[PDB]
């Protein structure tokens, strides 16, 4: 009875996997360019911090602490880029599978929501790379400048950078999702100050999910989520 | 548990007691149990 | 789960749907359930 639908899932997953593989090939063909794009803020921050240190006194750089670390980082970056470029095909197949499983009243919501979410995710990633990362990296490296030497390794930096980019994309999508919902009489200010009690618990559960078992990481991930919820309250208040 | 520790469980419990409080804790746990029982009902229906 | 993540579960499920497919997925799941029930029967027999 699941047969007429398992064939479609198989075929669409095959197309999505093929798209991801082609994207991985195209990305690994240009892994140097993507790696330079990723590492440009780090190099700029290190050069600026070196300038500050030389000014004060009158080194640190990007390293690799694993033998296969550079190759693994290149593969990871190429895989992430392949997923990102295959996301059009992936979401096309996913919607085509879920479309004849949704009533004729949820498509009209899901399409503009998905489109606006994608645009705001792109805007957030660009904002993080160009306006946040240059200042944040400089502040973080200058923080441990008079005590430690910044021998920054690429393996952890890649994960840190991707996490920042994805988090900023989501932090740009949530306050636009709030506006979109508030347009259609769905959530109002009162509706947002009455489910706050469960909202903070859900926020902390999400922080526990997306961070290592460390408590401090959970709190440091829950605080920006709380700020985004507070901003959402104002947005739905002035909607 | 997929990168999740016991201390995190304790922190979420602390938040739950603090913000929900005397009431809205029993109600929240009751509704979470009801939702989980409904999920189990769905998986039982699938396994039929 | 001993160095195992959820995304890995998803990759294994994708492989299972891709390679087994329409048939041999229900059969494989049925046989895995049968083997687990047999293991439980063995541990029940041990506890006697």
């Amino acid at each position: 009875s699941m047969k007429p639908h398992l064939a479609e899932l198989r075929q669409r997953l095959a197309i999505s996997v093929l798209a991801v593989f082609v994207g991985f090939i195209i990305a690994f063909t240009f892994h140097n360019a993507i790696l330079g794009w990723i590492t440009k803020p780090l190099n700029n921050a290190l050069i600026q911090v070196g300038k500050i240190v030389e000014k004060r006194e009158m080194n640190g750089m990007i390293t690799t602490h694993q033998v296969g670390g550079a190759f693994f980082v290149a593969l990871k970056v190429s895989f992430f880029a392949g997923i990102l470029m295959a996301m059009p095909v992936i979401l096309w197949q996913l919607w085509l599978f879920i479309a004849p499983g949704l009533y004729d009243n949820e498509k009209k919501m899901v399409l503009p929501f998905v489109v606006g979410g994608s645009v705001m995710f792109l805007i957030g990633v660009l904002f993080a790379y160009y306006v946040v990362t240059p200042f944040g990296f400089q502040f973080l490296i200058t923080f441990g400048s008079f005590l430690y030497t910044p021998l920054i390794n690429i393996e952890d930096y890649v994960g840190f950078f991707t996490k920042i980019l994805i988090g900023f994309g989501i932090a740009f999508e949530l306050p636009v999702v709030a506006y979109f919902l508030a347009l259609l009489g769905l959530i109002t200010d009162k509706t947002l100050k009455d489910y706050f009690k469960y909202a903070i618990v859900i926020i902390f559960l999400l922080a526990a999910f997306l961070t290592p078992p460390d408590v401090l990481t959970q709190l440091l991930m829950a605080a920006p989520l709380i700020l985004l919820y507070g901003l959402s309250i104002l947005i739905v208040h002035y909607v | 548990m997929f990168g999740m520790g016991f201390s995190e469980i304790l922190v979420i419990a602390l938040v739950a007691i603090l913000f929900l409080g005397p009431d809205k804790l029993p109600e929240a746990m009751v509704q979470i149990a009801k939702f989980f029982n409904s999920v189990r009902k769905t998986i039982n229906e699938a396994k039929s | 789960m001993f160095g195992m993540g959820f995304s890995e579960i998803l990759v294994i499920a994708l492989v299972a749907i891709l390679f087994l497919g329409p048939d041999k997925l229900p059969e494989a799941m049925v046989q895995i359930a049968k083997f687990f029930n047999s293991v439980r029967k063995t541990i029940n027999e041990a506890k006697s």
């Binding site: 009875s1 699941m2 499983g101 | 989980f36 229906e45 699938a46 | 959820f6």
Partner: peptide, 19 residues
């Protein structure tokens, strides 16, 4: 079996794999 039941049950087993 219809598609909506498929999505329901798939989401259910996905949740069960995260408990």
């Amino acid at each position: 079996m219809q598609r909506r039941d498929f999505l329901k049950y798939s989401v259910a087993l996905g949740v069960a794999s995260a408990l």
